[PDB]
Amino acid sequence: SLRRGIYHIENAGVPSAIDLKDGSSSDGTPIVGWQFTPDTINWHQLWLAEPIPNVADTFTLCNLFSGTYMDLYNGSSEAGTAVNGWQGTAFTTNPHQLWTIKKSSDGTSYKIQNYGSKTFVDLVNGDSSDGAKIAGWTGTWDEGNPHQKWYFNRMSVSSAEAQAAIARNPHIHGTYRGYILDGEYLVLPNATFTQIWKDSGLPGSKWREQIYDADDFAIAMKAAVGKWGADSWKANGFAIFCGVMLGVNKAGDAAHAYNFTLTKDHADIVFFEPQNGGYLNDIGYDSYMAFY
Amino acid sequence: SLRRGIYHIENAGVPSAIDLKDGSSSDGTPIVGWQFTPDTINWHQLWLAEPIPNVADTFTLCNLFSGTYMDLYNGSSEAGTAVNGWQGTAFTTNPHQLWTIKKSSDGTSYKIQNYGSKTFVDLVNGDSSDGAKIAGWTGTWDEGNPHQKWYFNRMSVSSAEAQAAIARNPHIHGTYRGYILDGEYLVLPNATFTQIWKDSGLPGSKWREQIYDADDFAIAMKAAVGKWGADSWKANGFAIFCGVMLGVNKAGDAAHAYNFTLTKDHADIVFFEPQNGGYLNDIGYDSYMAFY
Amino acid sequence: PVPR
Amino acid sequence: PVPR
Ligand SMILES: C[C@@H]1O[C@@H](O[C@@H]2[C@@H](O[C@H]3O[C@H](CO)[C@H](O)[C@H](O)[C@H]3O)[C@@H](O)[C@@H](CO)O[C@@H]2O)[C@@H](O)[C@H](O)[C@@H]1O
Ligand SMILES: C[C@@H]1O[C@@H](O[C@@H]2[C@@H](O[C@H]3O[C@H](CO)[C@H](O)[C@H](O)[C@H]3O)[C@@H](O)[C@@H](CO)O[C@@H]2O)[C@@H](O)[C@H](O)[C@@H]1O
Ligand SMILES: C[C@@H]1O[C@@H](O[C@@H]2[C@@H](O[C@H]3O[C@H](CO)[C@H](O)[C@H](O)[C@H]3O)[C@@H](O)[C@@H](CO)O[C@H]2O)[C@@H](O)[C@H](O)[C@@H]1O
Ligand SMILES: C[C@@H]1O[C@@H](O[C@@H]2[C@@H](O[C@H]3O[C@H](CO)[C@H](O)[C@H](O)[C@H]3O)[C@@H](O)[C@@H](CO)O[C@H]2O)[C@@H](O)[C@H](O)[C@@H]1O
Ligand SMILES: [Ca+2]
Ligand SMILES: [Ca+2]
Ligand SMILES: [Ca+2]
Ligand SMILES: [Ca+2]
Ligand code: NA
Ligand code: NA
Ligand code: NA
Ligand code: NA
């Protein structure tokens, strides 16, 4: 089963992602194929999949940027029916905005079927052009047709997955306690994490005894990433991943506060020094507390 | 013994505080008597007392706003010698900036003796006027003279005192853990705490599921009070008191994030709801974690 | 539970 | 100790 989370949905035949054109929130904004840059935020190409209770393998797909939903125009079963962004809600009964998403016959890519029409999301003619039509189209669950096959590239972690990444780190103190704040987190590329730090004003901040020391830098960086999340995205029901840690040195006679993020593969954490924007696999402290 | 901390130093005879005139950081800025408003920040009238190691009951007195030190001009023992703000450091050997501070003969007020001159801080003629001269003057430890007696009104708590205030609160969960970040905290009047909240932009922020929910409001308010501390004061070696708490309801099936501050008497905590600027003695949750 |  |  596809898990709740944020996905970059990439065609199996050509390197085009599912893109809400210009990120527009207007009802009837086309959803098109468009090229993408790996290890960036692809602003118009992130989709929050919300599972519908009591309907197997069926979701709403909310564009993270617009807050509008993938919508099969008037729910038509005609091949070539427009797929657009449309206002909706996460747990709608509107079958225009309900999608059954199950593994294709290759067992790695998915097919996306409209719950009402039973037609499939189709990159028409496998066109790799920027702005290529995506439509509802006749098809079957089992056929090889790459026009209708989609890799769901997972961009988010659960709190359970973030907890597992911390737990397998070699720099955790015996007394460690973690405090989880949210459920599902967008994982930032370091390039984006760095840009939020640069735009925070922290690079210019000076260390001062107690009044602006490590704990002030680490909390300011978490607040900046929280503010950036709310200001950047119109969808709800996720958070941005940015942790605060307190740590103690080997000798047990000095402590430090810092941030952490996750690797590309979501398996491990990486420490971030908000006083100089450095990423470290070893920051010289073992964490005794985190909140994220 | 006077404890390390921040003090509002009020004459025992007339309601004048020790004031660094216009808060100026210029060397030789007069220190004068000036009237004050209780339950405000008296911006030019707060003094950080730093104990000198291996010298009994002897301190530097650093103006919180200017970051400059109470200085007996050229260390003269002549009655009427100027007391000014002057650049220095927290642990100086300059006897112009070293003050022996011990209880007067009334056992409640203090006298302030220059370590070098052995003359006392004196509100000349007990003048209650705004801008009245304060000078080094002949005197004795035991005499009743109110010109040379000073109430040290304590404006800060230690981390130990903040921990005690939390521990005697009736809304702490059995599983509570606290994480202390700094050593000595300026306690804000609610009027100032509220002003920092109003100027943060949080009053305009909307609740949004995960992406800007209670934990985002509480962390944003702590970051705002941290930023205000660094931006407002030039002294180092203290922090501003503002806590974050996570709490769980009676039924154990809902949790919430919020802030807390301290009462005027420094004995108890008060909860602060950063989503509406309310102060509460009961916020409907029992704290299972705090950092402050 | 988780703070909201 | 205390974080710095
Ligand atoms: C190259 C081409 O691929 C397949 O045709 C696709 C279309 O496939 C789908 O629709 C057709 C009916 O038009 C049929 O229902 C099929 O089972 C279904 O997958 C469709 O993807 C369109 C739009 O992109 O492109 C092609 O026409 C295949 O059936 C054709 O024989 C041919 O190999
Ligand atoms: C009203 C006045 O109070 C006292 O005199 C103070 C001064 O007191 C201090 O200095 C004098 C010498 O001038 C002496 O050394 C005394 O022990 C010491 O406390 C001083 O505070 C000045 C400046 O404010 O004001 C008064 O002159 C007292 O000794 C006088 O007899 C008289 O009662
Ligand atoms: C927000 C906007 O993002 C980029 O433009 C988008 C564009 O982005 C994708 O396509 C471009 C090339 O045109 C790159 O491959 C990006 O990596 C992709 O994410 C599309 O989403 C289109 C259609 O919706 O909208 C554009 O605004 C970027 O080029 C802009 O400078 C800007 O940052
Ligand atoms: C920062 C400045 O603070 C106030 O003015 C100070 C003044 O403050 C004290 O005296 C006033 C009356 O003049 C009130 O009692 C305050 O409660 C006191 O704290 C003095 O410190 C003088 C001399 O150093 O400097 C002034 O700037 C306030 O009146 C101003 O509006 C302003 O907020
Ligand atoms: Ca939350
Ligand atoms: Ca601090
Ligand atoms: Ca600290
Ligand atoms: Ca949140
Ligand atoms: Na349209
Ligand atoms: Na379901
Ligand atoms: Na002067
Ligand atoms: Na001492």
Residue numbers in the entry:
A (entry chain AAA), B (entry chain AAA): 2 to 293
C (entry chain BBB), D (entry chain BBB): 1 to 4
Sentences from the paper on this structure:
The Marasmius oreades agglutinin (MOA) is the holotype of an emerging family of fungal chimerolectins and an active Ca2+/Mn2+-dependent protease, which exhibits a unique papain-like fold with special active site features. While acting as a dimerization domain, the papain-like domain of MOA retains the characteristic L-/R-domain partition of PLCPs. As additional feature, the MOA dimer carries two binuclear metal-binding clusters, symmetrically placed at the dimerization interface (Grahn et al., 2009). MOA requires the presence of calcium or manganese (II) to switch from the inactive form to an active protease (Cordara et al., 2011, Wohlschlager et al., 2011).
In an effort to validate our substrate binding model, we co-crystallized the enzymatically inactive MOA variants C215A and C215A/H257A with two synthetic heptapeptides mimicking proteolytic substrates. The designed peptides have the sequence PVxRAHS (with x = P or V). To our surprise, the co-crystallized peptide probes were cleaved in both structures, despite the fact that we used catalytically inactive enzymes. The observed cleavage products correspond to the N-terminal proteolytic fragments, binding to the MOA active site in the standard backbone orientation expected for PLCP substrates. Throughout subsites S1–S4, the peptides match the proposed MOA substrate model derived from the MOA-bound Z-VAD-fmk inhibitor complex (Cordara et al., 2016). The synthetic peptides are anchored to the active site through three main contact points: the oxyanion hole, defined by Trp208 and the backbone NH group of Ala215, the ‘site B’ Ca2+ ion and a backbone–backbone interaction with Ala256. The presence of an arginine residue at the P1 position unambiguously maps the S1 subsite to the carboxylate group of L-domain Glu210, which forms a side-on bidentate salt bridge with the Arg guanidinium group. The P2 moiety binds to the S2 specificity pocket lined by residues Leu247, Ala258 and Leu182# (with ‘#’ identifying a residue provided by the other subunit). Coupled to the long time needed to grow the crystals (2–3 weeks), this could explain the presence of a cleaved peptide rather than the full substrate. The peptide fragment occupies the S1–S4 subsites of the catalytic cleft and matches the N-terminal part of the expected proteolytic product, representing a snapshot of MOA just after the acylation step, mediated by a water molecule in the absence of the Cys nucleophile. A stretch of poorly defined electron density close to subsites S1′-S3′ suggests the lingering presence of the C-terminal fragment of the cleaved substrate.
